């Protein structure tokens, strides 16, 4: 009807009422932000100098969602300028709202001005909740979660606020082991929130599902009864996720939890399909890590290597050691199952870079194991499929691996028992080194035979000539 009204007014050359454009933008807010923004811009152009604070604020929020930082900042500045013409009754409320929006833009840009405006609004209006939530969240980021008293006080101030409770549960999940609080305290808090305030909150249901999944995963399995209890905990978590999907079938995190449960239940195909759909929906580090893990479980090692590389380059920027460990493991698996030497070389190089970044005993043992596997694979290879340079590099890596095994055996708490390290070092040194030297001798003889044939052929050719 509004489109027909616009068309009839355009055909009649009559001034289109901007209120119809505002109503169209409000309707399209839940359908298409682009069409709503275009209609709001048309309404602003029609009004000209009659633009109000609400229109400018909604334009700024539209550009903020469009990531148009410059245009959003300009619209917010125009809204702040037009705030001087607001009637005194609503002036305080609209000033608080505009200052909150400006503080949000600052929090995107620079946290110092955001904290300044947060303090100004808190002194101006202590009753507002989002201001306190964001300020305490920034304080927790700056202090590495050392403001548990502030979070508890905020929870006491607004026990009925869903946002406050969700932020408190997020802080609990983030720093429960750091603060030494009860593991089930967050579980009881979310249970109380669901029972007494709102049983349809997907955040608390997902939090309870994650807690139950963690409890089931950490639970030791000894017999069928323990497996049945673990399956019951997973069933409770799946019921939470299914309730979330019943509330909203467009929940990526519920599907992610379902895929994690399927991975725990070794349903690799469904988890792979869900993770691919999630990656198609949103792209974060966790989705790529889960895709790499599933590809490792699905034996698609090349796709795992690609997924881990994309994750590292997009998010970690070559700084996280865990992704490097995953890359090395995937390369080692591909080299082991496909008998490829270049995969072993790439895994060794990645492990060496990770060790140079960290210098940990675990990566030292990883380098030793990789070098031992390299030496074994090269020794198992025929003479025609290898050369002297690879043999020399494998032998040098074997010597360095034996020395590093002795070094690890002298440590306080090695990842593996020192007796096993010493036994493996002795077993390698007794046989593998001598087999490598015999392989070197055979390779030298083969190259010498080739060179003898090449030098003898040319003389006979010259004699015939």
């Amino acid at each position: 009807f509004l489109e027909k009204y616009v068309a009839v007014c355009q055909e009649e050359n009559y001034p289109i009422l901007p209120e119809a454009y505002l109503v169209l933008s409000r309707v399209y807010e839940n359908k298409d932000l682009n069409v709503a923004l275009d209609y709001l811009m048309k309404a602003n152009d029609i009004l000209g100098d009659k633009a109000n604070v609400y229109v400018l604020n909604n334009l700024g929020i539209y550009h903020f969602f469009r990531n148009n930082v410059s245009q959003s900042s300009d619209f917010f500045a125009q809204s702040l300028e037009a705030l001087n013409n607001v009637s005194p009754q609503n002036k305080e409320a609209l000033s608080i709202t505009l200052h909150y929006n400006k503080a949000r833009v600052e929090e995107v840009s620079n946290q110092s001005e955001a904290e300044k405006l947060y303090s100004k609004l808190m002194e101006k209006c202590p009753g507002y909740t989002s201001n306190k939530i964001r300020y305490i969240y920034l304080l927790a980021l700056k202090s590495n979660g050392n403001n548990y008293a502030d979070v508890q006080q905020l929870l006491d101030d607004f026990p009925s606020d869903l946002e406050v409770r969700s932020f408190y549960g997020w802080f609990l999940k983030r720093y429960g082991r750091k603060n030494g609080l009860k593991q089930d305290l967050e579980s009881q808090h979310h249970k109380d929130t669901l029972i007494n305030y709102d049983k349809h909150d997907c955040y608390a249901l997902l939090s309870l599902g994650n807690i139950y999944a963690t409890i089931a995963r950490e639970m030791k399995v000894t017999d069928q009864k323990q497996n049945e209890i673990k399956r019951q905990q997973y069933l409770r978590a799946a019921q939470f996720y299914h309730k979330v999907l019943s509330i909203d079938p467009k929940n990526i995190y519920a599907a992610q939890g379902i895929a994690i449960i399927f991975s725990d239940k070794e349903r690799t195909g469904l988890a792979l399909e869900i993770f691919k759909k999630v990656r198609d929906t949103v792209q974060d580090l966790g989705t790529f890590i889960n895709l790499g893990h599933c590809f490792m479980e699905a034996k698609q090692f090349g796709k795992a290597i690609e997924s881990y590389t994309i994750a590292l380059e997009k998010f970690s920027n070559g700084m996280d050691s865990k992704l490097l460990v995953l890359i090395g493991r995937a390369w080692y698996h591909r080299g082991f199952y496909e008998k490829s030497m270049d995969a072993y070389k790439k895994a060794l190089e990645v492990s060496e870079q990770a060790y140079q970044l960290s210098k940990l005993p675990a990566l030292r043992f990883n380098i030793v194991f990789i070098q031992f596997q390299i030496a074994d694979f090269v020794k198992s290879l025929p003479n025609t499929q290898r050369d002297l340079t690879t043999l020399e590099n494998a032998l040098s890596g074997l010597n360095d691996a034996i020395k590093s095994l002795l070094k690890l055996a002298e440590l306080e708490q090695p990842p593996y028992p020192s007796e096993d390290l010493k036994a493996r070092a002795t077993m390698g040194s007794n046989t593998l080194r001598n087999q490598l030297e015999r392989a070197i001798q055979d390779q030298q003889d083969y190259e010498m035979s080739i060179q003898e044939k090449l030098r003898t052929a040319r003389r006979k050719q010259q004699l015939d000539e």
């Binding site: 969602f65 799946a238 299914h242 999907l245």
Partner: protein
């Protein structure tokens, strides 16, 4: 007055949709048929 005037662009449950929503109804149906009805 602030609460009456305040409007939030995206809902609490719908925040995961954003500008591009996708449907996992088939995923939910498969989960119901293979976890809750699992034998």
């Amino acid at each position: 007055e602030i609460a009456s005037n305040e409007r939030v662009l995206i809902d609490h449950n719908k925040v995961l949709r954003g500008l591009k929503p996708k449907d996992f109804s088939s995923v939910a149906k498969d989960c119901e048929l293979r976890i809750l009805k699992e034998k």
